[PDB]
């Protein structure tokens, strides 16, 4: 949780007057959203923010961080999120926070994306957790079937008992794949399934791991 | 007309007595729900309809054939639904009523799932049609300009002046391709951009077309 700030404040470096920012989601890009907050307030940092969830967006309209949809931009010049996992050859789980979808559309648009993440993030293997996929609600529960009968050993999103629904309307089911020894292949295996909207692969995307552990804080180098 | 309620009606032989049926949309599919309801009114039939469309909730149970959602249900035994284009080799161009990711969802579930049209509907090659592409709505309009630099010549569905809005809240926007060669490359090229939630090519599900005619073609499957 220390680590956690100390990674998200550190990104916050990278933002420049002009640029379009994409604004990550979850406990970590929480302070780094809090760090560009701080600077356009103490520096007059000139941002325009592009959200990747709706608590992002009023996360950043307290702080007083210009936004613009993603719709409204060419291009993100910096975004930075977190994750659930990354491997060795920078590709991740995302979606653990319910929000993959948004992020996966702005990450996509970004010329340097950046994550955040503590030491415990970083796995020589992705799968060891469940693989969010985000799922059209109609038709989810005869998803969940197939899933189940090809062995994903799928759980739908809740919380507290309450079936989740992300913000674009979608439910999501967790799947304990347990090892993805091929995350591309499986990733564009998942695209062709109907009722699938998107899935937390996030494969070859990363540019800049920045990992805060007990002994500093790494900065990774994806150089595609 | 007349032909199109005949091949209507005939693609409604292939429902029985305790079948699960999808129930589509389409000009000829049209009047093969009617027959489902009249069997259902006048011939004792018993069935549950799983429907593709809003519009088809509503005339079906202005009919009073039972329905459920494909979620409560195990398998769909028989589908008929329209098609906007189908090709010699059994591919097709659907969602011109907005109803592609329930008509794909339904057509998944279904063992024998037929499409029943007339002869206008069948192409040699598919894309005179545009291409109905579902897609989420943040980012749509940056996505719309992607699909305008790559020269798909996109246009965002909309009805008297308003974006259209599918039951699951996406939008869509349609591509006039002109000609697809490969629906399969394509379908796959869809399927993996980011911000694209289904499209209406159709490719190796239909197992029959009946075509007004009367013609009933069987696809390889």
Same mark, same amino acid.
């Given at each position: 949780?220390?680590?956690?700030?100390?990674?998200?404040?550190?990104?916050?470096?990278?933002? @420049?007057?002009? *640029?379009?920012?994409? /604004? &990550?989601?979850?406990?970590?890009?929480?302070?780094? %959203?809090?760090?560009?907050?701080? =600077?356009?307030?103490?520096?007059?940092?000139?941002?325009?923010?592009?959200?990747?969830?709706?608590?992002?967006?009023?996360?950043?309209?307290?702080?007083?961080?210009?936004?613009?949809?993603?719709?409204?931009?060419?291009?993100?010049?910096?975004?930075?999120?977190?994750?659930?996992?990354?491997?060795?050859?920078?590709?991740?789980?995302?979606?653990?926070?319910?929000?993959?979808?948004?992020?996966?559309?702005?990450?996509?648009?970004?010329?340097?994306?950046?994550?955040?993440?503590? @030491?415990?993030? *970083?796995?020589?293997? /992705? &799968?060891?957790?469940?693989?969010?996929?985000?799922? %059209?609600?109609?038709?989810?529960? =005869?998803?969940?079937?197939?899933?189940?009968?090809?062995?994903?050993?799928?759980?739908?999103?809740?919380?507290?008992?309450?079936?989740?629904?992300?913000?674009?309307?979608?439910?999501?089911?967790?799947?304990?794949?347990?090892?993805?020894?091929?995350?591309?292949?499986?990733?564009?295996?998942?695209?062709?399934?109907?009722?699938?909207?998107?899935?937390?692969?996030?494969?070859?995307?990363?540019?800049?791991?920045?990992?805060?552990?007990?002994?500093?804080?790494?900065?990774?180098?994806?150089?595609?």
């Amino acid at each position: 949780e220390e680590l956690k700030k100390i990674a998200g404040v550190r990104a916050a470096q990278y933002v @420049e007057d002009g *640029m379009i920012v994409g /604004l &990550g989601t979850g406990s970590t890009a929480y302070y780094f %959203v809090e760090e560009v907050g701080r =600077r356009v307030q103490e520096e007059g940092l000139q941002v325009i923010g592009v959200t990747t969830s709706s608590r992002t967006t009023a996360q950043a309209q307290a702080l007083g961080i210009p936004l613009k949809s993603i719709d409204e931009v060419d291009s993100v010049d910096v975004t930075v999120d977190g994750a659930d996992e990354v491997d060795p050859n920078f590709n991740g789980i995302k979606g653990g926070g319910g929000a993959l979808l948004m992020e996966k559309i702005v990450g996509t648009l970004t010329k340097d994306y950046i994550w955040v993440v503590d @030491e415990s993030k *970083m796995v020589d293997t /992705l &799968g060891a957790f469940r693989l969010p996929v985000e799922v %059209v609600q109609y038709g989810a529960e =005869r998803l969940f079937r197939e899933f189940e009968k090809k062995g994903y050993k799928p759980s739908f999103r809740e919380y507290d008992g309450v079936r989740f629904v992300t913000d674009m309307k979608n439910f999501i089911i967790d799947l304990d794949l347990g090892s993805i020894p091929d995350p591309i292949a499986f990733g564009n295996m998942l695209d062709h399934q109907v009722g699938v909207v998107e899935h937390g692969l996030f494969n070859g995307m990363v540019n800049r791991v920045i990992v805060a552990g007990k002994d500093g804080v790494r900065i990774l180098e994806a150089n595609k």
